Amino acid sequence: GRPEWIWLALGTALMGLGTLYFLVKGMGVSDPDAKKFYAITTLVPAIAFTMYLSMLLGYGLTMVPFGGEQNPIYWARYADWLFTTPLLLLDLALLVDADQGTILALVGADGIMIGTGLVGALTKVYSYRFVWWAISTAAMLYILYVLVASTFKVLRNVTVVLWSAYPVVWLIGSEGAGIVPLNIETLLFMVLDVSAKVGFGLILLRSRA
Amino acid sequence: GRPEWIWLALGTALMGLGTLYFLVKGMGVSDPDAKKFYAITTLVPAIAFTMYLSMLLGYGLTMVPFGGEQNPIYWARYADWLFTTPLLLLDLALLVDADQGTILALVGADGIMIGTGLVGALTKVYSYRFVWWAISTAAMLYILYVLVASTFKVLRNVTVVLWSAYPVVWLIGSEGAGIVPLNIETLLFMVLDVSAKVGFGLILLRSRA
Amino acid sequence: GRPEWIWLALGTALMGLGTLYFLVKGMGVSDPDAKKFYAITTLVPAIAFTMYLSMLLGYGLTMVPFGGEQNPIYWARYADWLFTTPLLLLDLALLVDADQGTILALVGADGIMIGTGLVGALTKVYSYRFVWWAISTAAMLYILYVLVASTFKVLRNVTVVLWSAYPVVWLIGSEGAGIVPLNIETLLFMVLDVSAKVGFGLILLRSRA
Ligand SMILES: *C/C=C(C)/C=C/C=C(C)/C=C/C1=C(C)CCCC1(C)C
Ligand SMILES: *C/C=C(C)/C=C/C=C(C)/C=C/C1=C(C)CCCC1(C)C
Numbered sequence: 247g248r249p250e251w252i253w254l255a256l257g258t259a260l261m262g263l264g265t266l267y268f269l270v271k272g273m274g275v276s277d278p279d280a281k282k283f284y285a286i287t288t289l290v291p292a293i294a295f296t297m298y299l300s301m302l303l304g305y306g307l308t309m310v311p312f313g314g315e316q317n318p319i320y321w322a323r324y325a326d327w328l329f330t331t332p333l334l335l336l337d338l339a340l341l342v343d344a345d346q347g348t349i350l351a352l353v354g355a356d357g358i359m360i361g362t363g364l365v366g367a368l369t370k371v372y373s374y375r376f377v378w379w380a381i382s383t384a385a386m387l388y389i390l391y392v393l394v395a396s397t398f399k400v401l402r403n404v405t406v407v408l409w410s411a412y413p414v415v416w417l418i419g420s421e422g423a424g425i426v427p428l429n430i431e432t433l434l435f436m437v438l439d440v441s442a443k444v445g446f447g448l449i450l451l452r453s454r455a
Numbered sequence: 456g457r458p459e460w461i462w463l464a465l466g467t468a469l470m471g472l473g474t475l476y477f478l479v480k481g482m483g484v485s486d487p488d489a490k491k492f493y494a495i496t497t498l499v500p501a502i503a504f505t506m507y508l509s510m511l512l513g514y515g516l517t518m519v520p521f522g523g524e525q526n527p528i529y530w531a532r533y534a535d536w537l538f539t540t541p542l543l544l545l546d547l548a549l550l551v552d553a554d555q556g557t558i559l560a561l562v563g564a565d566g567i568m569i570g571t572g573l574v575g576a577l578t579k580v581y582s583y584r585f586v587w588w589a590i591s592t593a594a595m596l597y598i599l600y601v602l603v604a605s606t607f608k609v610l611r612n613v614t615v616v617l618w619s620a621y622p623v624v625w626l627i628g629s630e631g632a633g634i635v636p637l638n639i640e641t642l643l644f645m646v647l648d649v650s651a652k653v654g655f656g657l658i659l660l661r662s663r664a
Numbered sequence: 665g666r667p668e669w670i671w672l673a674l675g676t677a678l679m680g681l682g683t684l685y686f687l688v689k690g691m692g693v694s695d696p697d698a699k700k701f702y703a704i705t706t707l708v709p710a711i712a713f714t715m716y717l718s719m720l721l722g723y724g725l726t727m728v729p730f731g732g733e734q735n736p737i738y739w740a741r742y743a744d745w746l747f748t749t750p751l752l753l754l755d756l757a758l759l760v761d762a763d764q765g766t767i768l769a770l771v772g773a774d775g776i777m778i779g780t781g782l783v784g785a786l787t788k789v790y791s792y793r794f795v796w797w798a799i800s801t802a803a804m805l806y807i808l809y810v811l812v813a814s815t816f817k818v819l820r821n822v823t824v825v826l827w828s829a830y831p832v833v834w835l836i837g838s839e840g841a842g843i844v845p846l847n848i849e850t851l852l853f854m855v856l857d858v859s860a861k862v863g864f865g866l867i868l869l870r871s872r873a
């Protein structure tokens with residue numbers, strides 16, 4: 247029915263497959279710390295899966311009215327990003343043994359970043375959508391700012407490159423500028439999410455970090 | 456007005472009475488740890504009380520449309536379950552001195568379980584309600600999976616038997632199959648909640664755990 | 665358009681200015697603990713800023729119907745209070761090195777307090793609004809109940825006097841009794857918020873606590 251349904255079904259299946267591979271490999275962990283990284287890495291695609299399923303089936307999509315049109319917004323992404331992004335940041339934070347001040351700041355910065363994105367996504371006044379997009383980007387640069395060693399650096403670097411693509415997709419997407427159709431927007435985000443999560447997941451859990 | 460109002464008023468009063476008994480008995484605690492268990496055990500019926508009051512009075516109930524009918528759904532239960540279930544799991548987790556990996560996994564598993572229940576409760580497509588019910592049940596079996604010693608075992612066992620009744624109520628309830636009228640569904644859930652919370656509460660706080 | 669817009673623009677700017685002053689002064693912190701207090705103190709006006717911006721522009725305001733009228737409610741305040749109040753309580757809690765039982769209880773008490781305020785704010789049955797206001801006040805007295813030493817005492821005392829003004833504003837405001845117009849209500853709350861946050865912020869971060 248919806249042309250981006252295939253990307254949605256394809257994200258759901260891939261988040262589904264990542265959760266499981268990780269649940270199974272996670273059996274044989276006595277290490278308190280590896281338990282921490284295994285819990286986080288698996289939870290991320292797990293919550294991700296559920297939200298991809300929500301979007302795939304009509305739940306997780308609304309028509310936000312702006313520009314003289316009702317616009318299809320997939321709100322369910324922010325409900326996923328709300329929990330997964332702080333946890334990915336928790337893997338990195340934990341990985342390099344960061345302090346409370348930093349992890350909290352990182353996680354707090356994360357909250358407002360995804361928190362302003364939702365508002366930008368839901369704002370009925372076209373112009374303002376971009377004001378909120380801006381506050382979100384600034385929170386991101388703060389996180390990228392604040393952001394064993396070898397595997398951390400490779401992960402810190404994967405994070406940086408992948409996350410920075412999100413605001414651009416939002417900006418050019420059907421969410422911002424409206425030049426990129428929802429299709430490829432759902433496709434691009436599906437590629438970002440399975441990498442930032444499953445790719446990130448593998449790199450990490452497969453490592454000796 | 457609503458026939459299950461009595462169960463709602465009866466749940467509110469009982470959650471009300473459990474919160475208080477616990478607040479008062481909680482006075483005389485110097486123990487850092489007993490403080491932890493006292494804070495959790497009291498918070499649970501406390502948040503519970505507020506949500507029973509919300510449902511009792513019209514707030515906390517919506518008409519979800521499916522099956523060619525508008526259906527009365529008590530969304531307020533998921534707003535309560537969202538916070539109380541992870542805390543009950545926190546009593547057990549803390550009780551047996553579980554690791555970060557486990558408690559997080561438990562709490563993360565909990566979130567999606569109640570998180571998928573809400574979506575199942577709110578899904579307008581009858582068929583899908585059960586797809587989400589299924590993902591929720593699987594998260595539960597994961598928790599029951601992962602799930603001093605004497606009092607833990609009695610508590611672990613109370614949890615297991617009580618929580619497993621919830622999906623069945625949802626499934627046969629006015630939320631799922633629609634064979635059990637809302638009345639007895641509100642009644643059964645009122646009995647599950649006052650046990651999983653007040654009963655659990657007593658067993659625990661009354662113990663030497 | 666809205667007469668309280670100036671208070672909203674004036675709160676946004678002031679929360680904006682507090683966040684920044686704190687972000688900049690927060691550069692030169694090697695102390696794990698000062699990092700904790702710097703992360704919290706800055707996050708508070710930061711989340712505050714975003715919610716003042718939300719209210720300033722139409723997002724963050726709804727017409728709740730009661731009394732035979734549709735009433736302008738600024739729901740966005742509860743979305744801010746939800747996160748900032750537990751963090752202000754975290755500064756104090758951390759400041760005096762409180763236990764897990766206490767901080768959790770404090771934070772849990774906080775949640776229901778702001779959590780009942782939102783419901784009171786959203787209740788369509790005029791009479792009930794006050795029932796929920798009451799449960800919220802009781803949670804507050806519980807927090808004020810539970811509530812280096814010199815700077816803690818000055819902060820504990822600032823908290824107490826400022827927070828106690830909130831329920832009265834709500835009660836006499838356009839949210840409760842409806843005797844105080846939204847204008848001065850937005851003005852009074854703007855003064856409470858910039859003090860409880862920026863004032864509190866300065867007192868604390870400027871100190872040797
Ligand atoms: C698994 C998903 C991840 C890591 C998602 C990350 C999303 C972002 C970093 C989004 C950022 C945005 C902005 C900076 C501006 C507003 C729009 C957003 C939410 C797309
Ligand atoms: C105090 C309340 C407690 C402990 C409530 C527990 C509720 C559950 C374990 C619910 C489980 C459900 C499913 C497994 C499937 C979807 C429907 C639910 C939410 C009833």
Ligand SMILES: *C/C=C(C)/C=C/C=C(C)/C=C/C1=C(C)CCCC1(C)C
Nearest residue numbers: 781797800801804827830831834860
């Ligand atoms: C930065 C904001 C702060 C510290 C806000 C605090 C707000 C309160 C303490 C509000 C309390 C309320 C009641 C006790 C009853 C219901 C209405 C409220 C939410 C205004």
